[PDB]
From Swiss-Prot:
Homodimer; homodimerizes following heparin- and ligand-binding. Interacts with CBL, IRS1, PIK3R1 and PLCG1. Interacts with FRS2 and SHC1. Interacts with PTN and MDK. The EGF-like region drives the cytokine specificity for ALKAL2. This is ALK tyrosine kinase receptor. The active site is at D149 (proton acceptor). ATP binds at H32, K50, E97, L98, M99, D170. Residues 24-284 form the Protein kinase domain. The chain holds residues 1093 to 1401 of 1620 of the full protein. The gene is ALK. Expressed in brain and CNS. Also expressed in the small intestine and testis, but not in normal lymphoid cells. It is found in: Cell membrane. The modification Phosphotyrosine is found at Y4, Y39. It comes from Homo sapiens (Human). Changing F145C: In NBLST3; somatic mutation. Phosphorylated at tyrosine residues by autocatalysis, which activates kinase activity. In cells not stimulated by a ligand, receptor protein tyrosine phosphatase beta and zeta complex (PTPRB/PTPRZ1) dephosphorylates ALK at the sites in ALK that are undergoing autophosphorylation through autoactivation. N-glycosylated.
Amino acid sequence: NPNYCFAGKTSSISDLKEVPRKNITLIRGLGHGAFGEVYEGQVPLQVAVKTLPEVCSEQDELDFLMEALIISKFNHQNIVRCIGVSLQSLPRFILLELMAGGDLKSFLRETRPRPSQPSSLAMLDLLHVARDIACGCQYLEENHFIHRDIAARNCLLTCPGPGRVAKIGDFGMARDIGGCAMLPVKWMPPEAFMEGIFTSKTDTWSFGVLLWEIFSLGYMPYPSKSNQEVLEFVTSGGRMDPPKNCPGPVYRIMTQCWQHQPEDRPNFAIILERIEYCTQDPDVINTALPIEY
Ligand SMILES: Cc1nn(C)cc1-c1cnc(N)c(O[C@H](C)c2cc(F)ccc2C(=O)N(C)C)c1
């Protein structure tokens, strides 16, 4: 058993809440997570079940055990809860809070305002998603945990509807810490992909890119640019333009997050202050989002 330390405490696989396999029942697949499936399931309690391929290397497994350890020790409303694990049967299961809304990136793409659904999403919705994740980022920051891949694809939503809550839901990056084309360089600050240096200011840069993902309604960052072109571009002082219709106050948060010097980039308390100010600002939240035909 590997060790894990967080918030002043070491824990071990023994600390994971084993749920007996007989209590768990798979319902439907939900998606392929590169390595292994995720199911909807019941334990009645509804769950997403992250599975470990029965055929996998020893590292695949440690990664898996490690991810459970990480997610279980977090306690916050914008970080996905772990109901427990089922390690004592194959395939091994990690049991998570079922997030009906699915991942944030898919959500933004499929629920973009449309001619048929002209107002499926408003500025205030995105502002609320942003605040949610930044609040989870605040929680990580003040516990000295560096996520390393804050991006829309690693965020989930409780429900499709307006009372939706965004949480951070994947931690397989801070877990692995692969190759160049694997690293998410489009979400990375310059010192991270140049020097391998990670601090809390890493997540601030990444959060700016996520902010861009959110307000563009789910686009790939630096549109039309490859990883290497981004690397040179970002390294030369280039930054993304505002997404379609983005309010200037919101774009300003992004650019503040994309400061070359990490010590010049805000901490998440400041970012929250600024997002709160945007939600209060009628010129921001009255701004209509683009309808794609
Ligand atoms: C409903 C629903 N629809 N969809 C499309 C996904 C769900 C869903 C609901 N609740 C979860 N807890 C959950 O977790 C997984 C581990 C996950 C977490 C994450 F942050 C990013 C992606 C995934 C993912 O979907 N993978 C294949 C890796 C998935």
